[PDB]
Design a protein around this ligand. Structure first.
Ligand SMILES: [Mg+2]
Ligand SMILES: [Mg+2]
Ligand SMILES: [Mg+2]
Ligand SMILES: [Mg+2]
Ligand SMILES: [Mg+2]
Ligand SMILES: [Mg+2]
Ligand SMILES: [Mg+2]
Ligand SMILES: [Mg+2]
Ligand SMILES: [Mg+2]
Ligand SMILES: [Mg+2]
Ligand SMILES: [Mg+2]
Ligand SMILES: [Mg+2]
Ligand SMILES: [Mg+2]
Ligand SMILES: [Mg+2]
Ligand SMILES: [Mg+2]
Ligand SMILES: [Mg+2]
Ligand SMILES: [Mg+2]
Ligand SMILES: [Mg+2]
Ligand SMILES: [Mg+2]
Ligand SMILES: [Mg+2]
Ligand SMILES: [Mg+2]
Ligand SMILES: [Mg+2]
Ligand SMILES: [Mg+2]
Ligand SMILES: [Mg+2]
Ligand SMILES: [Mg+2]
Ligand SMILES: [Mg+2]
Ligand SMILES: [Mg+2]
Ligand SMILES: [Mg+2]
Ligand SMILES: [Mg+2]
Ligand SMILES: [Mg+2]
Ligand SMILES: [Mg+2]
Ligand SMILES: [Mg+2]
Ligand SMILES: [Mg+2]
Ligand SMILES: [Mg+2]
Ligand SMILES: [Mg+2]
Ligand SMILES: [Mg+2]
Ligand SMILES: [Mg+2]
Ligand SMILES: [Mg+2]
Ligand SMILES: [Mg+2]
Ligand SMILES: [Mg+2]
Ligand SMILES: [Mg+2]
Ligand SMILES: [Mg+2]
Ligand SMILES: [Mg+2]
Ligand SMILES: [Mg+2]
Ligand SMILES: [Mg+2]
Ligand SMILES: [Mg+2]
Ligand SMILES: [Mg+2]
Ligand SMILES: [Mg+2]
Ligand SMILES: [Mg+2]
Ligand SMILES: [Mg+2]
Ligand SMILES: [Mg+2]
Ligand SMILES: [Mg+2]
Ligand SMILES: [Mg+2]
Ligand SMILES: [Mg+2]
Ligand SMILES: [Mg+2]
Ligand SMILES: [Mg+2]
Ligand SMILES: [Mg+2]
Ligand SMILES: [Mg+2]
Ligand SMILES: [Mg+2]
Ligand SMILES: [Mg+2]
Ligand SMILES: [Mg+2]
Ligand SMILES: [Mg+2]
Ligand SMILES: [Mg+2]
Ligand SMILES: [Mg+2]
Ligand SMILES: [Mg+2]
Ligand SMILES: [Zn+2]
Lengths: 65, 275, 131
RNA sequence: CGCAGAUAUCAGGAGGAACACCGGUGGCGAAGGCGGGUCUCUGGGCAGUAACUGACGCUGAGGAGCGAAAGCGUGGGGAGCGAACAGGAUUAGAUACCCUGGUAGUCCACGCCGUAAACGGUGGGUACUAGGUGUGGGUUUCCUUCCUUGGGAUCCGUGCCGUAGCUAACGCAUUAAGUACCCCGCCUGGGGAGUACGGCCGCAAGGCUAAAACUCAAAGGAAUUGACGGGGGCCCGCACAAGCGGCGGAGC
RNA sequence: UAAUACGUAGGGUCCGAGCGUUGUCCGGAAUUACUGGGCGUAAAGAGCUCGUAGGUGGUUUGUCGCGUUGUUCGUGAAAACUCA
């Protein structure tokens, strides 16, 4: 199991501005992948989902094109 | 709300009414009243045209501004939301900064002290009138008109009002309470917000006396008429009339609209039942 | 709710004997001190003590065990409890293990053992049957 | 259901229900139960400073509030799904399993009804009692890169396994059934029957409180081995398959 | 159809001037569990909360002692039980 990449204090914050950051965690299909593969916080993942899905509603990530 | 009456006497057990706790006045603005009278369901000839109607409690008519275009760009205050029996809904009097008092229909949730503006610049808050060029698609409106200044004619329904759908060219499509969609010109005028007295349909008459009050007389059933006076008349006992029900003048159920109307093209589709 | 300090103390003692402890810490009280007097003078608890803690004075109990690991106290059951309280007359003093046990009796002089009460002719409330 | 142009497939429009992945043996809630987002008002739980009150504590007969789904009233809504209901089919028989459809309901608003295997089949609260393996929450402190599930300690909730003990056993095993304490519900063989009569509640369906007679001399719980299974894994036989020749036809 | 369980015989057992049946009541029945029960499934924790009355209390500093035991004489009929 790999590390909680976000969860350093040196690491970047959590938000929805980072379209590249959210793309890096959303697959090419456009779905949310699993913690079992991503290896980050369960909490961090909660934040990631909130940010990515805010971006989706603001039309920043494809809706299964 | 609703207050169900307590069954003191038998003829008063089922009588439930709506409380008019919101009214503020007890005598209508006298500068805006005209003489009216139960017409008795008779035309210039005097022969009864429509049955069941006539007699009842006399009522005083008041002119109310469905023409609400004669004043623009001048606000008015909601003076008093009073009751007129002649109409289903409630009429609220407005004080204009100009100095006119005019009657209008009272939309749902309107209370004394609010502001009213009428024109193409008004806000979208309920109670404002403005041609449909300036009204967002999807909103709920009432007291609609049928042409640019012919006076509102539709959706006076106490408790229900029309829904705007979409603007194309110079027409707008309306979802409207009969369940029907009407194409209509967009130069007409309308007002935003559902009409008031949404609970008026909750009334339970409950007493033939009050039905008479409201004015309509009794209906004489069909199969009981004599055969001479009506198609189902006759039959020693109870006999269905031996034929499919029919209007007293010999036309049974079924389509009645005269298609081809000038508005036949303006209509989009037709109302649905049991769908 | 600590609604029976005596019961809780006795439960702690027997539980510590079962778990094979050496020291048991409890909040200190006058009744605890005099009951420790009784038991230590009878020889069931190796020695007690009263110390000072962050808030209130407490006590630690030092037990013994039989030379072959033997437990010092076999059974502990309260008799007079909140709600159900039991007293005894000068003649009907309770008998535990036919005298092989010690019953703590509250009499005018204070708390004394069953033999002390029987010889003095005094009586009171029996606290606990210790064996 | 289609040759009246079906399916598919593409443009547009309508509209209702519900939000995969995040999403797990995870959060919260006292309990039912609750998760697409945004805002609005707001409840509950936890960590350090421990400032202040200072025996106010606990739990609770009656009472009263909450309380899944189904059901009922009123008026809206009603895509999908779908009791009941029609047909098609299997079957000796099918008022079912399956198919075509398809009305209540399913959703909204306000009232209702108060029962579930409402289960962790375990009432609430406090104190004590070896460990191992994880989550999430918040704190500190040090190898200190001071990056770091690096290391230490702490308290809250949350999964499993396990000593001693307990237990009828299966099993529980510090989030006890252990060893105690305080209070409350409840039970005394099986039917009869949670039903008859009665009282209370409900508009109802019914709900709550709760009998007797007569009959049976057992009914039930965990567990041991068989037997069997249109329950699973590994095996063998002219068992199957591939071949010949056959009896069931006639006389004898 | 071949009874130590029916009846007859013998033989045996208990008891005895009484012996059985029946019926009422206690017991074993800890089978209404105060002494001295249980609640997972065998019968049982209500569906879960707040909370009135009642029931119950986290400490030590202080008196009256009404809860209490402490002893002295002072009542407890006779008759019945226990000792001689
Ligand atoms: Mg966060
Ligand atoms: Mg009536
Ligand atoms: Mg007047
Ligand atoms: Mg008039
Ligand atoms: Mg004429
Ligand atoms: Mg009529
Ligand atoms: Mg007249
Ligand atoms: Mg009216
Ligand atoms: Mg219509
Ligand atoms: Mg008629
Ligand atoms: Mg007639
Ligand atoms: Mg005539
Ligand atoms: Mg005729
Ligand atoms: Mg007739
Ligand atoms: Mg007839
Ligand atoms: Mg007709
Ligand atoms: Mg004390
Ligand atoms: Mg006891
Ligand atoms: Mg298509
Ligand atoms: Mg202080
Ligand atoms: Mg209580
Ligand atoms: Mg209380
Ligand atoms: Mg109660
Ligand atoms: Mg009560
Ligand atoms: Mg309530
Ligand atoms: Mg209530
Ligand atoms: Mg439901
Ligand atoms: Mg429902
Ligand atoms: Mg019905
Ligand atoms: Mg209803
Ligand atoms: Mg309806
Ligand atoms: Mg619909
Ligand atoms: Mg069906
Ligand atoms: Mg059928
Ligand atoms: Mg269907
Ligand atoms: Mg029930
Ligand atoms: Mg549930
Ligand atoms: Mg409970
Ligand atoms: Mg407890
Ligand atoms: Mg274990
Ligand atoms: Mg052991
Ligand atoms: Mg426990
Ligand atoms: Mg138990
Ligand atoms: Mg019984
Ligand atoms: Mg019952
Ligand atoms: Mg009853
Ligand atoms: Mg009942
Ligand atoms: Mg069992
Ligand atoms: Mg077995
Ligand atoms: Mg073969
Ligand atoms: Mg042959
Ligand atoms: Mg043959
Ligand atoms: Mg014989
Ligand atoms: Mg015999
Ligand atoms: Mg004999
Ligand atoms: Mg007896
Ligand atoms: Mg018992
Ligand atoms: Mg049971
Ligand atoms: Mg229960
Ligand atoms: Mg119940
Ligand atoms: Mg005295
Ligand atoms: Mg005396
Ligand atoms: Mg005396
Ligand atoms: Mg005498
Ligand atoms: Mg005697
Ligand atoms: Zn993290």
């Amino acid at each position: 199991t790999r590390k909680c990449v976000f969860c350093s204090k040196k690491g970047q914050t959590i938000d929805y501005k980072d379209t590249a950051l959210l793309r890096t965690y959303i697959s090419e299909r456009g779905k949310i992948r699993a913690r079992r593969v991503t290896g980050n916080c369960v909490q961090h993942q909660r934040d990631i989902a909130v940010a990515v899905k805010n971006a989706r509603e603001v039309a920043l990530l494809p809706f299964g094109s | 709300g609703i207050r169900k009456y307590k069954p003191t006497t038998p003829g008063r057990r089922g009588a439930s009414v709506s409380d008019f706790a919101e009214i503020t006045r007890s005598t209508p603005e006298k500068s805006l009243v005209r003489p009216l009278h139960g017409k008795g369901g008779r035309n210039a000839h005097g022969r009864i045209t429509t049955r069941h109607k006539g007699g009842g409690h006399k009522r005083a008519y008041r002119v109310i501004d469905f023409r609400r275009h004669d004043k623009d760009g001048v606000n008015a205050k909601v003076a008093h939301i009073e009751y007129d029996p002649n109409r289903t809904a409630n009429i609220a009097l407005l004080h204009y900064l100009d100095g006119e008092k005019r009657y209008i229909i009272a939309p749902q949730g309107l209370k004394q002290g609010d502001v009213i503006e009428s024109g193409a610049n008004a806000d979208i808050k309920p109670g404002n009138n403005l041609p449909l060029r300036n009204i967002p698609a999807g909103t709920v409106i009432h007291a609609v008109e049928l042409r640019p200044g012919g006076g509102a004619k539709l959706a006076r329904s106490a408790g229900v009002s029309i829904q705007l759908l979409g603007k194309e060219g110079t027409y707008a499509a309306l979802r409207m309470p009969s369940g029907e969609i009407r194409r209509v010109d967009v130069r007409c005028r309308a007002t935003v917000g559902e009409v008031g007295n949404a609970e008026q349909s909750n009334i339970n008459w409950g007493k033939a006396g009050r039905m008479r009050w409201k004015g309509k007389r009794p209906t004489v059933r069909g199969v009981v008429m004599n055969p001479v006076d009506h198609p189902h008349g006759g039959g020693e006992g109870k006999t269905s009339g031996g034929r499919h029900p029919v209007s007293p003048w010999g036309k049974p159920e079924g389509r009645t609209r005269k298609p081809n109307k000038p508005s036949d093209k303006l209509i989009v589709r037709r109302r649905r039942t049991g769908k | 709710t600590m609604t029976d300090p005596i019961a809780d103390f006795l439960t702690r003692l027997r539980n510590a004997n079962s778990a094979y402890h050496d020291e048991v810490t409890l909040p200190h009280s006058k009744l605890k001190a005099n009951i420790a007097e009784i038991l230590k003078r009878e020889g069931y608890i190796s020695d007690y003590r009263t110390e000072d803690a962050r808030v209130g004075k407490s006590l630690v109990v030092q037990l013994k065990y039989g030379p072959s690991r033997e437990r010092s106290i076999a059974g502990l059951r309260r008799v007079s409890k909140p709600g159900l309280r039991v007293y005894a007359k000068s003649t009907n003093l309770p008998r535990v293990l036919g005298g092989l046990g010690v019953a703590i009796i509250s009499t005018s002089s204070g708390l004394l053992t069953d033999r002390q009460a029987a010889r003095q002719g005094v009586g009171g409330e029996v606290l606990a049957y210790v064996w």
